[PDB]
């Protein structure tokens with residue numbers, strides 16, 4: 001229920017007015033990349049602030065699955081992106097899910113490297129422009145999500161702040177010291193590497 005998330009955003013990502021929910025959007029995507037260090041073989045995560053107030057997260061995990069999911073008749077990726085808790089990682093006895101980020105984004109770009117192919121899909125408020133599609137060949141595996149947050153959901157503090165992201169990435173590095181984490185700001189060229 002993408003509308004259900006937009007109806008109750010605080011219940012998923014926190015306060016939508018003081019900047020904290022805005023930055024929790026990034027941390028949800030980063031938490032999904034971090035989980036692949038154990039669930040897959042992720043060794044490197046790159047978090048970039050773009051000049052148009054979007055953030056991307058690139059990992060070298062397994063890649064969000066791309067095959068057609070039988071019940072929905074669309075790619076698994078699309079299901080993961082549009083259906084709350086979908087994807088085989090939610091344990092109702094054990095966070096939020098990339099579908100929450102998609103629901104609360106004006107636009108989301110998804111690029112997956114998996115099974116020899118590059119795959120791409122663009123969403124607007126959680127609605128795909130086209131089915132996931134193959135764009136080329138690759139030997140890599142991984143997932144890149146770049147999102148532009150919805151100004152219908154996020155108010156007041158709406159711009160991403162380098163220092164808020166660096167502080168949480170520095171904590172995450174301490175607890176995941178085998179993963180290379182890079183933060184880059186395209187606006188001014190600032191970067192930090194952890195550990």
Ligand SMILES: CCC(=O)Nc1nc(C)c(-c2csc(Nc3ccc(C(=O)O)cc3)n2)s1
Nearest residue numbers: 032033057061062063064087088143144145
């Ligand atoms: C942008 C950073 C990001 O979100 N990376 C992400 N990588 C992955 C891999 C993500 C994800 C979300 S549910 C999910 N399920 C599966 C289930 C099975 C397999 C497999 O059998 O191979 C891989 C992933 N995988 S989310």
